[PDB]
């Protein structure tokens, strides 16, 4: 029946300055209209119920405006710690219960260029057959970054894949981890392993390598 | 101070039937106070309601799965479970059980339980190895977590002591159709030696359990 429509799907600001997002409804409401935070991995928390009035331990910093068909959420100052998904949610005095899609707010920050550490393979896991060359980039900023494997001095394609953290909370940066899959009987193969990382707070693309067998 | 858990198999068949059940505490289920409820959320997407409970017996369902939700409660147990038949891939999510307040106040989902990952596949559950990626004024540690399935695991650092600097990273499906994933932490260079780095591997879905100590090399 009712329908909740948030608006926008994912924003982008600076820490301090001032956000707003926008939930729709298909009627005249009038119902509820109540604001959840939900930071990934975890359940989400209730910020404000029946449209203005803030749940408890709740920052000042968030303020709720609306009635009828429109409805804002408002974080008077963006803070690291709002990286989050906000949903409004809809109800009556009995159920049935709408969510909105969500509205995912991200932070913009300082340029941070990345820490780079290599892993090789551990001698565990060479036991078992497989060769995985780990390459780490800690707590950079912006998330857009280029990671290349070259093995013996050969570019390589295909056998690398990577994954990326949410923003972190408290200073707003990615980490991202580099995974190239080898078997052991071609791990053995070579001796140079290098991984490049291209990002914009580097001047120049930076190599870490290890020769195998040399510690 | 109300909490909810659930307890669910994880991995369901498709076309086979969900069964997940939330123990409550701190409150009894056959309060007037209540609806209970269940919500799930697919891996990047939002929050979807799919059904909840009072006491009578008063079931409200989504119009959208109305179909196939069943939704009881059990007040010698305090429990309330949730029946999905005919489970699809699009089923697939993160399960939640929460309550909601019926008479004091708006209806909002006061508390959540955690969440409870059902992935609908015929793939065997696979408990995960363990690799060290040993250290060598900053210095990177971790745990390589491979060939599991189907997700989550659940990594610590010395039983949660450690919780600065550490990154578990999402987990990547694999040619093979295993996960892996990689957990991280960023320490001292000083402590290496006189600080020990253990990280602590839960899979559920395998009722596996490993602790793998990282050294340096
Ligand atoms: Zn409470
Ligand atoms: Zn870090």
């Known amino acids: 029946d009712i329908q909740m429509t948030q608006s926008p799907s994912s924003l982008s600001a600076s820490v301090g300055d001032r956000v707003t997002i926008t939930c729709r409804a298909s009627?005249?409401?009038?119902?509820?209209l109540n604001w959840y935070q939900q930071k990934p991995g975890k359940a989400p928390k209730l910020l404000i119920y029946?449209?203005?009035t803030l749940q408890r331990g709740v920052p000042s910093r968030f303020s709720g405006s609306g009635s009828g068909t429109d409805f804002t959420l408002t974080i008077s100052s963006l803070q690291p710690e709002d990286f989050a998904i906000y949903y409004c949610?809809?109800?009556?005095?009995?159920?049935?219960?709408?969510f909105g899609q969500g509205t995912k707010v991200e932070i913009k920050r300082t340029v941070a260029a990345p820490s780079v550490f290599i892993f090789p393979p551990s001698d565990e896991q060479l036991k078992s057959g497989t060769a995985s060359v780990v390459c780490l980039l800690n707590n950079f900023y912006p998330r857009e970054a280029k990671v290349q494997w070259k093995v013996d001095n050969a570019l390589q394609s295909g056998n690398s894949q990577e994954s990326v953290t949410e923003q972190d909370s408290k200073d707003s940066t990615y980490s991202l981890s580099s995974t190239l899959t080898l078997s052991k009987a071609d791990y053995e193969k070579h001796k140079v392993y290098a991984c490049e990382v291209t990002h914009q707070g580097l001047s120049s693309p930076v190599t870490k390598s290890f020769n195998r067998g040399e510690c | 101070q109300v909490q909810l858990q659930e307890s669910g198999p994880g991995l369901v068949k498709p076309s086979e039937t969900l069964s997940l059940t939330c123990t409550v505490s701190?409150?009894?289920?056959?309060?007037?106070?209540?609806?209970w409820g269940w919500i799930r959320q697919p891996p990047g997407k939002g929050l979807e309601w799919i059904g909840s409970?009072?006491?009578?017996?008063?079931?409200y369902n989504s119009p959208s799965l109305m179909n196939r939700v069943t939704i009881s409660l059990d007040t010698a147990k305090n429990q309330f479970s949730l029946n999905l038949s005919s489970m699809t891939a699009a089923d697939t999510a993160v399960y939640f059980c929460?309550?909601?307040?019926?008479?004091?106040?708006?209806?909002?989902?006061?508390?959540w339980g955690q969440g409870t990952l059902v992935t609908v596949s015929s793939a065997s559950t696979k408990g995960p190895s363990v690799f060290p990626l040993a250290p060598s004024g900053t210095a990177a540690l971790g745990c390589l977590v491979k060939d599991y399935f189907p997700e989550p695991v659940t990594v610590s650092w010395n039983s949660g002591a450690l919780t600065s600097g550490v990154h578990t990273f999402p987990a990547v499906l694999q040619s093979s159709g295993l996960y892996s994933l990689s957990s991280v932490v960023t320490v001292p260079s000083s402590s290496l030696g006189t600080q020990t780095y253990i990280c602590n591997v839960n899979h559920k879905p395998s009722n596996t359990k490993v602790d793998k100590r990282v050294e340096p090399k």
């Open positions: 929460a309550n909601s307040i019926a008479v004091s106040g708006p209806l909002y989902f006061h508390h």
């Open positions: 701190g409150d009894s289920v056959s309060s007037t106070n209540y609806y």
């Open positions: 029946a449209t203005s």
């Open positions: 409970i009072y006491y009578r017996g008063i079931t």
């Open positions: 949610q809809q109800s009556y005095s009995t159920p049935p219960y709408t």
């Open positions: 009627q005249s409401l009038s119902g509820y």
